[PDB]
Amino acid sequence: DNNPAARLEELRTIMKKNKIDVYILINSDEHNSEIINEKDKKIVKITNYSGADGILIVTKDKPILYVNALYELQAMNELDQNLFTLRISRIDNRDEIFETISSLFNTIAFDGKNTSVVFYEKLRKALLNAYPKKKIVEKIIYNNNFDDVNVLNFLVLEKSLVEIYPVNNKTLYIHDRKYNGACAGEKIDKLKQSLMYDIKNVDNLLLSELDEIAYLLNLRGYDYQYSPLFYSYLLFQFDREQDFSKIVFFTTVKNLPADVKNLLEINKVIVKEYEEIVPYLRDVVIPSIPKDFKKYDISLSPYINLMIYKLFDRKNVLLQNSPVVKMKAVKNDVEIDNMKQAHILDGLALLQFFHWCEQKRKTKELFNETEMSLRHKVDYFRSTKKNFIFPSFSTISASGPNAAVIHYECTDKTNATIKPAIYLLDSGGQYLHGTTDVTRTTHFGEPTAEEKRIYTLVLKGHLRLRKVIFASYTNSSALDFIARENLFNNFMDYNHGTGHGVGLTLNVHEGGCSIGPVGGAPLKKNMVLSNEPGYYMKDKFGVRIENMQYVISKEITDTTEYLSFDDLTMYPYEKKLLDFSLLTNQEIKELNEYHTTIRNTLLPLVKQSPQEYGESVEKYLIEITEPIAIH
Amino acid sequence: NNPAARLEELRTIMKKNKVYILINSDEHNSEIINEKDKKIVKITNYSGADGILIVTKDKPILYVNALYELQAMNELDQNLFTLRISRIDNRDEIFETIFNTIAFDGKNTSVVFYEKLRKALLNAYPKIVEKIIYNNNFDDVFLVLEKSLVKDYPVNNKTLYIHDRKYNGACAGEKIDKLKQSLMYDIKNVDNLLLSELDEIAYLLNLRGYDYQYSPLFYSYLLFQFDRQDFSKIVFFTTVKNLPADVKNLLEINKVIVKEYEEIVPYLRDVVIPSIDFKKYDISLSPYINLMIYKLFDRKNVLLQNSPVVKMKAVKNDVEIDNMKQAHILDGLALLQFFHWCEQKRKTKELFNETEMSLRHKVDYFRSTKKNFIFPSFSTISASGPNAAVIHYECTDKTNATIKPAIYLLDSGGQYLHGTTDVTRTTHFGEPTAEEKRIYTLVLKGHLRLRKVIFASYTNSSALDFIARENLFNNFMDYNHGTGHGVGLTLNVHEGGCSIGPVGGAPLKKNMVLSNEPGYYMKDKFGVRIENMQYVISKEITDTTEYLSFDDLTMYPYEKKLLDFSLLTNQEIKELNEYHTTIRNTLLPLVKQSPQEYGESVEKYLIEITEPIAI
Numbered sequence A: 001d002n003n004p005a006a007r008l009e010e011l012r013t014i015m016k017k018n019k020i021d022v023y024i025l026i027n028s029d030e031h032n033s034e035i036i037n038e039k040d041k042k043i044v045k046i047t048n049y050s051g052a053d054g055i056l057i058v059t060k061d062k063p064i065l066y067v068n069a070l071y072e073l074q075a076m077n078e079l080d081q082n083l084f085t086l087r088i089s090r091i092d093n094r095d096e097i098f099e100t101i102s103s104l105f106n107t108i109a110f111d112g113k114n115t116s117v118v119f120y121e122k123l124r125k126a127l128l129n130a131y132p133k134k135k136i137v138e139k140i141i142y143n144n145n146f147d148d149v150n151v152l153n154f155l156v157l158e159k160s161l162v163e164i165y166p167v168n169n170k171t172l173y174i175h176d177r178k179y180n181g182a183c184a185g186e187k188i189d190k191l192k193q194s195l196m197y198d199i200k201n202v203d204n205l206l207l208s209e210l211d212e213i214a215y216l217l218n219l220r221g222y223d224y225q226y227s228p229l230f231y232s233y234l235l236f237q238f239d240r241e242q243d244f245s246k247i248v249f250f251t252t253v254k255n256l257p258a259d260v261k262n263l264l265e266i267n268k269v270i271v272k273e274y275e276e277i278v279p280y281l282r283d284v285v286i287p288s289i290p291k292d293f294k295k296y297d298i299s300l301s302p303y304i305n306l307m308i309y310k311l312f313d314r315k316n317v318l319l320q321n322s323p324v325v326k327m328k329a330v331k332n333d334v335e336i337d338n339m340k341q342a343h344i345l346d347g348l349a350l351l352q353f354f355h356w357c358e359q360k361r362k363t364k365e366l367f368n369e370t371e372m373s374l375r376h377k378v379d380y381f382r383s384t385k386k387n388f389i390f391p392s393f394s395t396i397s398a399s400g401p402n403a404a405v406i407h408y409e410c411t412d413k414t415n416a417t418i419k420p421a422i423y424l425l426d427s428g429g430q431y432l433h434g435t436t437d438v439t440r441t442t443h444f445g446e447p448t449a450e451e452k453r454i455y456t457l458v459l460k461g462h463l464r465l466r467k468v469i470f471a472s473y474t475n476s477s478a479l480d481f482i483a484r485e486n487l488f489n490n491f492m493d494y495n496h497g498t499g500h501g502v503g504l505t506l507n508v509h510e511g512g513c514s515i516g517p518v519g520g521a522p523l524k525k526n527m528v529l530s531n532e533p534g535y536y537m538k539d540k541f542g543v544r545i546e547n548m549q550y551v552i553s554k555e556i557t558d559t560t561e562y563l564s565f566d567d568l569t570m571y572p573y574e575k576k577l578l579d580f581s582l583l584t585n586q587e588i589k590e591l592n593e594y595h596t597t598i599r600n601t602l603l604p605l606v607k608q609s610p611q612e613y614g615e616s617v618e619k620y621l622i623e624i625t626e627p628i629a630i631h
Numbered sequence B: 001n002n003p004a005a006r007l008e009e010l011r012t013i014m015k016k017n018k019v020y021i022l023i024n025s026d027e028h029n030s031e032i033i034n035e036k037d038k039k040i041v042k043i044t045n046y047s048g049a050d051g052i053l054i055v056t057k058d059k060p061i062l063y064v065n066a067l068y069e070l071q072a073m074n075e076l077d078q079n080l081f082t083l084r085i086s087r088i089d090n091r092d093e094i095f096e097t098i099f100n101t102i103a104f105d106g107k108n109t110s111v112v113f114y115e116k117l118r119k120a121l122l123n124a125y126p127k128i129v130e131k132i133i134y135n136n137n138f139d140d141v142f143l144v145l146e147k148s149l150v151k152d153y154p155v156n157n158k159t160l161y162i163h164d165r166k167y168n169g170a171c172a173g174e175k176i177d178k179l180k181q182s183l184m185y186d187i188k189n190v191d192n193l194l195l196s197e198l199d200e201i202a203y204l205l206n207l208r209g210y211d212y213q214y215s216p217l218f219y220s221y222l223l224f225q226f227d228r229q230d231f232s233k234i235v236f237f238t239t240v241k242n243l244p245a246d247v248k249n250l251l252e253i254n255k256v257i258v259k260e261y262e263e264i265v266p267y268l269r270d271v272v273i274p275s276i277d278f279k280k281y282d283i284s285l286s287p288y289i290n291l292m293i294y295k296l297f298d299r300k301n302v303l304l305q306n307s308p309v310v311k312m313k314a315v316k317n318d319v320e321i322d323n324m325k326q327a328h329i330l331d332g333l334a335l336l337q338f339f340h341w342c343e344q345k346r347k348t349k350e351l352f353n354e355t356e357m358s359l360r361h362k363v364d365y366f367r368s369t370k371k372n373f374i375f376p377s378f379s380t381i382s383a384s385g386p387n388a389a390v391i392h393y394e395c396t397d398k399t400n401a402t403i404k405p406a407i408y409l410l411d412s413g414g415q416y417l418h419g420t421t422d423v424t425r426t427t428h429f430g431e432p433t434a435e436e437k438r439i440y441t442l443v444l445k446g447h448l449r450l451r452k453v454i455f456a457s458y459t460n461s462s463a464l465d466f467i468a469r470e471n472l473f474n475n476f477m478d479y480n481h482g483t484g485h486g487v488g489l490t491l492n493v494h495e496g497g498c499s500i501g502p503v504g505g506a507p508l509k510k511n512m513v514l515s516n517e518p519g520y521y522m523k524d525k526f527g528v529r530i531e532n533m534q535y536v537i538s539k540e541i542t543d544t545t546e547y548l549s550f551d552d553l554t555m556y557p558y559e560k561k562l563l564d565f566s567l568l569t570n571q572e573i574k575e576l577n578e579y580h581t582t583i584r585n586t587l588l589p590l591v592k593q594s595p596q597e598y599g600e601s602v603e604k605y606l607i608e609i610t611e612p613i614a615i
């Protein structure tokens, strides 16, 4: 069974020989991607725990695995605890892991490319606070040579101790201006302006965030499954006396085509290889810098990997968001229009999927289908659509009790038969037009009063956030609250955020803005956000209703600008799940307004392609967009 | 009191000394400052509380908060001084707006304004040298002045007194012990703490004083010296002639050494400072501490942060809450007497011979009748008609208006041994227009929502500010102030540690005491504000979550004449009746037990305004 006990007892033989007392493994890559590829998944190889979130502490004792609360169920069914100790990290338990390591040994090791500076600094500060009489020495270990080292040794490893897959040779391609509305040259010019005015204390900026590099250069790639990104670093050297000294692009050159180097060399970009980043920083750059108002040597993203961080002296590094974060959080008008087209396509795909579900429901063949079968079906209907690339994340297809698991990951052994019950579908896709994220909840059986109540309580928060009018200064955490409001009155909550930013053909989860309880800021026009309240009833069912929307200016008076949202997502809601004792007439009016707009948008497109859809499809569309009676 | 004369006279004293910056503030950063600290008004004849005066060779520039703009416009002469306004988005304009040797009042300037100004001017003029000027000797050379360039006026000899445990529920020793633990665990990088906030010192020592009009505070400093594991020395700087016999008993009981007030700077420079990657700080100072004390230390060694006392007093213990309920019971009775009085004169038309100030005096009187009353907690706002549209409206001798059959707004409160009250009610002495009724009800809807709102404990207080605005937002209307502020116990009516507002925000904790006061102000016509005080309670605890809500402190009804029933939900009607009935159940037995202070006419009036709405 790819024996865990074996690979673990094997692991401590490699540690002992290098005189390493405690090893720390984390699920991460060097670019801090949410979804990491196979080469970077070490923890699963040892523990047979495939959950995305995890941190493994490996000592002479039984190893400890830390996972987020949302992954607790998955870890319980996967990990066997006679080998590993399972600990859970909750909202109040977060720094436990930092305490835990402190409470145990003289030499600790880290994967240099798999460890963020945030986790490193907090652990190290914990140890200063834990053992003040001990001094810490930090060394980078190159090519597995440990022979160069009272004291606590922090070892940052170039090569990982766990060695590991398929490789991507597919070529990079240009994202056309018609889709992104802004050329790579203007964006670089914008980054240039930022260095003149906004950040004056650094001449050197390193972009390690893959969606930032792709966005700035208008390039996409195949190095990741769910995002059209590519392994890269992009280094800017600014000369105050007022432009860029050097622009260096680290990436995989064999994946660089002819006419990409045309756009690249036009902007005066020097191309190096991907693995050249560390030696280039260590050898050419850091020695080239000269030694009241402080001036920093380098500006790094907050989550930059440990290996690149440790090349410098901490006093000279500035950890902050790249200017690209703000740049890309606000879409231009071409970008919004393109995001509308993508959602039109995605509405058609959902229409085909639920039409398909409805037919098989009537024929009852639907209940021989599985979660994976339905997951594959919606992904298929998207692939038929124009300018589609691939799904924007792993589709969540959950029937009955599985819908109560937010992070539910359908395995080959977890796959469930579709039942006449609640069905939750969270899915999206990557288009040249943009990135989509949408959730709909439906019912293939006869909905209970509880199910309709929960759905409607969730819907009310969702509908509120759709049309909410708020002064421009309003903190986005206030918008998170009104989505929870109706659940709060019933003493119910959901354990995730209400909305996340979404990139344009980049990442389905994008920073720069959000709607959530912890942290928040005013929203700006043409920010693109999800709206997805939910509620999850353990062992019974779960509900989530998700749209994407963008911020508009609603009205401007003498003293104040009022903002609101406009819809991106076009698909109707589930009438079978509606509780009308909870619904106001205004909400019903907004429901009818939305559904009518959907019919007006989708129906002509359905009709012009009778071979692709047909009368049964358009008839289904008409019925679910039909106005609800007010009386 | 010629401004031009005093301005050109001001220019005789600076020129000999080779931009002067005047601010309305005192050394303890109090909202309300005494006569000794108002310099700007002497030059500009601008009596507004908030202001900063930039004095250069050109025409001087005065910066005031937006709420003081109306007052500043008719008072200030604008051909002499340039008037600029500070709103929510122009906050740093003045620093941009802000030359060679520049001067500041050392005791009237906070380090926040000082450091932000210096960092900004550096940000492009890449070098600055800073010197302290003692006793007006400038010949040794940013200039920080010990003595101001701009003081005959009165002094308080009234005695300090002890705040009994029965009111505050915790002894001074217990609070110090809490402050002690804080230094053990929470703050390990500094051994020295200086309390410059008068309400923090008053709270900790359970002492009150007469040095301020609207708050029972006293000029003081309190310095703590921590030794790795207790306080080595605790020194209390204050005015000893105002220190009575048995207060110095409570002081020496806590092993506090009493020095005088003016010894603060000499004791710091001479006695303490000559002592003492992972950094250790010499001193911890409150963010708004004056420059004079700040410049005794090097910036690198100065840790600027909220004292632990801020968190301590922002959360009331149960005795403190119970006392504050008693305070509001008394203040409900006072309001009852006042509006009953207004109603009587309304029927006879005698009300419209009354003025705003006369009504202001009347409500303050009815408070003075109540047990354990000390004085008003702030200047009572009494505004009729168009004046109600002014948020900051200060009734003057020349602004005093005859009471009219129109909107009337009353914002008032008092200091009790039991606590500090703040309450606003808006009523109508005429026949309310549909517009007036609509605006009142839109404000009320936000107010009522904030009363009973259920929120998970992590909810940012800015979310609560929003739901108070939302019904106004839908009509594209807003109010230019915050929704709520913290309130001290027999302390400042505006207290930090928490708030409900659009900009800053944090989760709320149980037994925090906050105002709830949405409003709307229609220029030149009328204005409405509805204010309660309430405290945070635990509503429900589930497996995964704690839900919080508020419980009422303020007991007084709302105005039925101003209700727009097209805007009111049945839930809102139900809550109104629940509140009004509760008020009757609370107040009526007390009204009945004192017929000579509260007549039969009063009991009937109370019953009428607490009567259920037909829904």
Ligand SMILES: [Mn+2]
Binding pocket: A426, A427, A437, A438, A439, A546
């Ligand atoms: Mn989704």
Ligand SMILES: [Mn+2]
Binding pocket: A437, A438, A500, A530, A532, A546
């Ligand atoms: Mn989403």
Ligand SMILES: [Mn+2]
Binding pocket: B422, B423, B485, B515, B517, B531
């Ligand atoms: Mn107030």
Ligand SMILES: [Mn+2]
Binding pocket: B411, B412, B422, B423, B424, B531
């Ligand atoms: Mn008030």
